[PDB]
Amino acid sequence: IEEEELTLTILGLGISIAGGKGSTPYKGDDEGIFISRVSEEGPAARAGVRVGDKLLEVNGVALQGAEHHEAVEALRGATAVQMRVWRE
C-alpha cells in the first residue's frame, strides 16, 4: 500500500475530518487534513471516500497545508464535491 491520488465525488455527509496546520495532527508528523470517520450510509461512502484519505482539494479550494476551519468551511460551501485526496 503506497500513495495514489484520486478524485471522489460526493452528493450531513457522514465524514468526520481531523488535522490541519496549527492543530492536533491526525497521525504521526503530518499536519494534513484527513478523513477520520466515514459513516456507512453517506454519499461519501457510495462515492468511495475512505478513512485515512488525506484531503488535497475540495472544489478547487486547495486544502494542502490549510488550517482545520478552512476545510470545514470549504466542505459546507461546495451539491457536487470534486474531492481530491491522497490515499495509501
Partner: peptide
C-alpha cells in the same frame, strides 16, 4: 478536533 461536515 473532528467535524462531521
Amino acid at each position: 478536533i473532528e467535524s462531521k461536515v
